[PDB]
Structures are given as structure tokens and as C-alpha cells.
Ligand binder design. Structure first.
Ligand code: HEM
Ligand SMILES: *[C@@H]1O[C@H](CO)[C@@H](O[C@@H]2O[C@H](CO)[C@@H](O)[C@H](O)[C@H]2NC(C)=O)[C@H](O)[C@H]1NC(C)=O
Ligand SMILES: *[C@@H]1O[C@H](CO)[C@@H](O)[C@H](O)[C@H]1NC(C)=O
Ligand SMILES: *[C@@H]1O[C@H](CO)[C@@H](O)[C@H](O)[C@H]1NC(C)=O
Ligand SMILES: CCCc1cc(=O)[nH]c(=S)[nH]1
Ligand SMILES: [Ca+2]
Length: 595
């Protein structure tokens, strides 16, 4: 513990407190310590950072300094040697829908973002990074090992910039460098309304006191809306299809359009907002557009929070759920609702659930179109497919009917992601997320696998016979030790995901513990949590207890047949049923009798 903080977070804000609304920035959630949970501030450090210089230097950066007596293996090599796999045969989760994979990234984006640093624009310094792959300052290239096929096709490194950090943008001394978390730690739909007032505003429709969110002009989904277009260029969305010339979406989170399905749900969530703002004016026609806005925004929030804690997490967590998330017992102010720096690495167990393809299913859930099933790698920043081909409905059916990819040690991340990822400003569909995840753990200064085993009060294996036992996988261990000399150097992401999944869940014991407390801290520490008295009425809570993704789709698309359990893999037409048989959100409890 040194000092009271570091510079670069907005010095002064206000808290109306009497306001029964969340700020946009997340300030004023907590009267004791305002900035807690707030956007554009440092991620929380549950354990001390770890760097070659103990300050701002990532491990491996040096080429001589070894970690714990050994050099760290290149990210790209553990990815290839342990993470890669060819055969997509048999990798689907028999009981997890694609929706299952698709809510984690939605939730992930509500909760955190490490702003990646590229700094200036007029930059050849960017050219130095990718073309020549020059190490230095914030560029920190992932070199390819020998015998790396990409080698013959994309020079000798995948560019990779470090993550933003508190105080300077340049590194400093006398304190461990902390990465920034640009969104709000709370589960407050800040991936839809923004985390900066500036954005929140331009995101709204202010030309009508209807409390609506802004929607697109140039196009519609045969009646329904589409988020406005992110006006700035270049546009990775245009790049993928210059002919199409269709840009990315304007939404709270800046990552909204990374892959088609994500913008799919982002669209459903935006519709849901207006949908309410409309009905809130039907029942309460005496409110100002501001109120419509904040009430809808309030409502959309508990929804996210319900789906997430009620239906999502109990199956991600399984048997270690009620351990870390025993039923609600009140808003504990002494709780740090800040998102941990190592949580942002722990939640991307969500990558190993992403399957290689994405299909558009017709209104009878047979393949819509002749190119009905598409390769996932053609869907990064792909908005033209939605707009100029099908709309949201087709893709929403595949979300309900298609499976997610089950995690499996010999088959961890699909090539659409391992070899063919795409990245803005980069013109090639040749990126490795797995490697980026790894180069990332270092970039932040993550403690190694065993510091996290121990911290979670779990056996921290020292040996090879010691490791095998814990993953229950003989050769994954061998491979790991060969690549990572000792369990202590294994970068956490793969370390955490390398464990088998716990009873009924989809994550190993370590991630179970890392996630457990982080979600227990977003709730307990949320002054605006939908279940805490004050924030909602018993008549209102009652209503909120009825929501369902199924309903979400029914209210904001033209689908008709849906499954009662949107996540438990559902098959058609057996598991599917009509919208009428699906409970709705009664909006009666919000109405105000003016007299
Ligand atoms: C493409 C990508 C996805 C799907 C096709 C995808 C999916 C997920 C899910 C389902 C997650 C959680 C359940 C999840 C979490 C996080 N991701 Fe990931 N993701 C795709 C692509 C990316 C890319 C690119 C990044 C950037 C990584 C970097 O260091 O540059 C990425 C990150 C994350 C992440 C870290 C978030 C943060 O704190 O900034 C998750 C928690 N994903 N994804
Ligand atoms: C780029 O986007 C354009 C714009 O839609 C696409 O052109 C269409 O693609 C399919 C062809 O199978 C059908 O929509 C039409 O036959 C095409 N129309 C036009 C205007 O050509 C094109 O498919 C995309 N191609 C790339 C580079 O992805
Ligand atoms: C704002 O709302 C008005 C009133 O319905 C509507 O005419 C207009 O299209 C909306 N603008 C945006 C950008 O949503
Ligand atoms: C899927 O998981 C749920 C858990 O709620 C279970 O009840 C459902 O029956 C399961 N069905 C299948 C197809 O495994
Ligand atoms: C580290 C940045 C986080 C991130 C970016 C992105 O584009 N998609 C996802 S899921 N996460
Ligand atoms: Ca948030």
C-alpha cells in the first residue's frame, strides 16, 4: 500500500443522491468512496502486479531476463502447441445454446474493458510495430516461433499494443502500473447507454421528449430498428466489405460490433429500451423525456442483472455457485464492486465456447438462404450481413437453436479465432486470440498460475506428477511443463482454462473461485441492485421476476417460436413453443396516478 492514488481520472463530479438513478460514469454509487466501480479508473489488484522490473515491464519483454529462472514461452507457441485444433467434429455442447456463449461476452462488456493503446494516428510508429515488429514503449509484438506457418505469410510477428494505464500513457516508476477499466464495473447496461455522459447523450434521442435511444435512419429490419452508425473512419466494418460500404454500430460499448451475433443482441437490447420508453409514456403520459429515459434505463438494467444471476451464472458456476453467490442479503457498502484486473482475463473462458460457424435459420428453422451457414471468421465486424442480408431474425434463431462449442483440453480455441481473427486497422483475417490473451496477461503484470491457485485456497502443484493430478490430463500437463517450465510461470488464462470443468458448470475450480467473488462483489456492492429495497417496489420486483430472453426476443423481433430456457440447448420444434406461452413483463406496477 503506497499513496492514495494516481492521476488521470476526472478530479471532481457530483452525486444528487436523492436521484434514484445511476450516474453514467458509475460515480456516486457509493457514498463512502464515490469513484468505486466508476468508469475510466484503474482495475482492482487482488494480488500484486508482477513485472521484470516490478513496475511497468511485462515478462518476456527482455530476451534475457527470465522469470523464476526460466524464459517465458512465446504466446504464439503455447497457442499452437496446446491450444490449437483442426477437427471441429464433436465440439458442440449438448446442453448449451449459442445464446449461452453470446451472453457472456454481453455481460463481459457491460462489466469491463481494458482500452487497448495505439496512441497517435499519424503513425509510422504503428508501421514499426507490425511491419518490422519493433519492441518498445507500448508496442509489444508477439513474434512467431520457427516452423510457424503464418511466418511465411505475415512477416515475423503479430503486432500487439499494451493496455491503457493510470497516470501517464507512458510507463512510470515508484508504483506498479495499473490498467484502466473504461466501462462501469456495475451490471448497469453501460454497454448500451455508455460510460461517458458525452456518449450517453449523443446516444439518446433528444429531438423528442420520448426518452428514446437513437436509432438508424438509412435502414430498418422490416419494421424494427437498428442502432445508429458509428460515424468515424476508418471503419473496420467498411473494410471487410468496401463494396457493401456498411459501417459499425453506435452503442454504449465501443466493441458492440466485433462479431455479428454481438451486434445482434446489442440490437435486441436497444429495441428493448425504446419498447419500454413507449409503454412508460402510455401508462405515465405525464413524465418528461428524461424520466422515460432513466426509468427504461433502470428497467433494462435489472433485466440484464436477472438473466445474468438467475439463468446464466448458475450453470457457468454450477456446484460452486451458492458457495460464492449465496442468495441476496443486502447492499454491503464495505464491499469493493470494482472489477479485478485478473477477472478480465478470467471471464474470457468465454472464448473457448465460441464455435467455428454461425447460421441464419428461416422461420421454420431450416437454413435461411443458400449460404445459410457461414464461417465465423467472416463475421468479425460484419454489419453488412445483417443489414443487406436477412435482418436480425434469422441470426436470432441460430442463437436459440445452435449449440455453443464445449470446452475441451485437446480442442480449446477454434481457428476462426486461433489463426483467423481480425483486428481493426489491420487488414488481415490472421490473428490469434489465444496468443493475444497470453501476451495480455503479461502486459498487465498478472501473477502466475499458482499465485492464483493459492489465493483461491487451492492446491498449488509444484511437479509434473503434481500437475497431471489436478487437470486430470496427463499429456496436457507434460505439454504445459515443456512449454512453461514450472506451473508457477504458466500464464493464468490458459492455466485457469486448462483445468477440467466443475460439477454442472463450464469452468475449472480456479475460475470458479475467481468469478465467484467478482460477481458476488458486483451485486453486494451495487447500491442500485434491483433486489435491494428502495431501488424497486415489491410490486415492481414481482414484475421483474418474470422476464426471459425468450420474451426479450418475442418483444423485439418477429420470431414466434422460442424455448422457455433460452440457454439449456433447445431443439426445434420439440423444445420450441409460441410467444404467448411465455411470461411477459407487466408494466402496470410502474404507472403513476397523478392525483
Ligand atoms: C471475436 C470474439 C468473441 C466471440 C466470437 C468473444 C467472445 C467472448 C465471450 C463469450 C466472453 C465472455 C463470456 C468474452 C470475454 C472477453 N473477451 Fe472476448 N471475444 C472475442 C474477441 C475478443 C477480443 C479481440 C478481445 C481483446 C483481447 C485483448 O487483450 O486484446 C477479447 C477480450 C475479451 C475479454 C477481456 C475484456 C477486457 O477486459 O477488456 C473478455 C472478458 N475478446 N469474449
Ligand atoms: C460485399 O458486400 C456486397 C454488398 O451486399 C455483396 O454483394 C452481394 O452479395 C451476395 C452475392 O451472393 C448477394 O447479396 C448479391 O448477389 C450481391 N450484390 C451485389 C451488390 O453485388 C458481396 O457479397 C460482398 N462481398 C464481399 C467482398 O464480401
Ligand atoms: C427521435 O424520436 C423522434 C420522435 O418519434 C423520431 O421522429 C426520430 O426518428 C428519432 N430520432 C432518432 C435518431 O432516433
Ligand atoms: C439442460 O439443462 C437443464 C438444467 O436446468 C436441464 O433441466 C435440462 O433438462 C437439460 N436438458 C438437456 C437437453 O440436457
Ligand atoms: C481487452 C478488450 C476486450 C474486448 C474487445 C472486443 O472487441 N471484444 C471483447 S469480447 N472484448
Ligand atoms: Ca457497467
Amino acid at each position: 500500500s503506497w499513496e492514495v492514488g494516481c492521476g488521470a481520472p476526472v478530479p471532481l463530479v457530483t452525486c444528487d443522491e436523492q436521484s434514484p438513478y445511476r450516474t453514467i460514469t458509475g460515480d456516486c454509487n457509493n457514498r463512502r468512496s464515490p469513484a468505486l466501480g466508476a468508469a475510466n479508473r484503474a482495475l482492482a489488484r487482488w494480488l500484486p502486479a508482477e513485472y521484470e522490473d516490478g513496475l511497468a515491464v511485462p515478462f518476456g519483454w527482455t530476451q534475457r531476463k527470465t522469470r523464476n529462472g526460466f524464459r517465458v514461452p512465446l504466446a504464439r507457441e503455447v497457442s499452437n502447441k496446446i491450444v490449437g485444433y483442426l477437427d471441429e467434429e464433436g465440439v458442440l455442447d449438448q446442453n448449451r445454446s449459442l445464446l449461452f456463449m453470446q451472453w457472456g461476452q454481453i455481460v463481459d462488456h457491460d462489466l469491463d474493458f481494458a482500452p487497448e493503446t495505439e496512441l497517435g494516428s499519424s503513425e509510422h510508429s504503428k508501421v514499426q510495430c507490425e511491419e518490422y515488429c519493433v519492441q518498445g514503449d507500448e508496442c509489444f509484438p508477439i513474434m512467431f516461433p520457427k516452423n510457424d506457418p503464418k511466418l511465411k505469410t505475415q512477416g515475423k510477428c503479430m503486432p500487439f499494443f499494451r493496455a491503457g494505464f493510470v497516470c501517464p500513457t507512458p510507463p512510470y516508476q515508484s508504483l506498479a502500473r495499473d490498467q484502466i477499466n473504461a466501462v462501469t464495473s456495475f451490471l448497469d447496461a453501460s454497454l448500451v447507454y455508455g460510460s461517458e455522459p458525452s456518449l450517453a447523450s449523443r446516444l439518446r434521442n433528444l429531438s423528442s421528449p420520448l426518452g428514446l435511444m437513437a436509432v438508424n435512419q438509412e435502414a430498418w429490419d422490416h419494421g424494427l430498428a437498428y442502432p445508429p452508425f458509428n460515424n468515424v473512419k476508418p471503419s473496420p466494418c467498411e473494410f471487410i466489405n468496401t463494396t457493401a460500404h456498411v459501417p459499425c454500430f453506435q452503442a454504449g460499448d465501443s466493441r458492440a460490433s466485433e462479431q455479428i451475433l454481438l451486434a445482434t443482441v446489442h440490437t435486441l437490447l436497444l429495441r428493448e429500451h425504446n419498447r419500454l420508453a413507449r409503454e412508460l409514456k402510455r401508462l405515465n403520459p405525464h413524465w418528461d423525456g428524461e424520466m422515460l429515459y432513466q426509468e427504461a434505463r433502470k428497467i433494462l438494467g435489472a433485466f440484464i442483472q436477472i438473466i445474468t444471476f438467475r439463468d446464466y451464472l448458475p450453470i457457468v458456476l454450477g456446484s460452486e455457485m451458492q458457495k460464492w453467490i449465496p442468495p441476496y442479503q443486502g447492499y454491503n457498502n464495505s464491499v469493493d464492486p470494482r472489477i479485478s484486473n485478473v477477472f478480465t482475463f478470467a471471464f474470457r473462458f468465454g472464448h473457448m465456447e465460441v464455435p467455428s460457424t454461425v447460421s441464419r435459420l428461416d422461420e421454420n428453422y431450416q437454413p435461411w438462404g443458400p449460404e445459410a451457414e457461414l464461417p465465423l471468421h467472416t463475421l468479425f465486424f460484419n454489419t453488412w450481413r445483417i443489414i443487406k442480408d436477412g435482418g436480425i431474425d434469422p441470426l436470432v434463431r441460430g442463437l436459440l437453436a445452435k449449440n455453443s462449442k464445449l470446452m475441451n483440453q485437446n480442442k480449446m480455441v477454434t481457428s476462426e479465432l486461433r489463426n483467423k481473427l481480425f483486428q481493426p486497422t489491420h487488414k488481415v483475417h490472421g490473428f490469434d486470440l489465444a496468443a493475444i490473451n497470453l501476451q495480455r496477461c503479461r502486459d498487465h503484470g498478472m501473477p502466475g498460475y499458482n499465485s492464483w491457485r493459492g489465493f483461491c485456497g487451492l492446491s498449488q502443484p509444484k511437479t509434473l506428477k503434481g500437475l497431471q493430478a489436478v487437470l486430470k490430463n496427463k499429456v496436457l500437463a507434460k505439454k504445459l511443463l515443456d512449454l512453461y517450465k514450472t506451473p508457477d510461470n504458466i500464464d493464468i488464462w490458459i492455466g485457469g482454462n486448462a483445468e477440467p470443468m466443475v460439477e454442472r458448470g463450464r469452468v475449472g475450480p480456479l475460475l470458479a473461485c475467481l468469478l465467484g467473488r467478482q460477481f458476488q462483489q458486483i451485486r453486494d456492492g451495487d447500491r442500485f441492485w434491483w433486489e435491494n429495497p428502495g431501488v424497486f417496489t415489491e410490486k415492481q420486483r414481482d414484475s421483474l421476476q418474470k422476464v426471459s430472453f425468450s420474451r426479450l426476443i418475442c418483444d423485439n423481433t418477429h420470431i414466434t417460436k422460442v424455448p422457455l430456457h433460452a440457454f439449456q440447448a433447445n431443439n426445434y420444434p420439440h423444445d420450441f413453443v409460441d410467444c404467448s406461452a411465455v411470461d411477459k413483463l407487466d408494466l402496470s406496477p410502474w404507472a403513476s396516478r397523478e392525483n
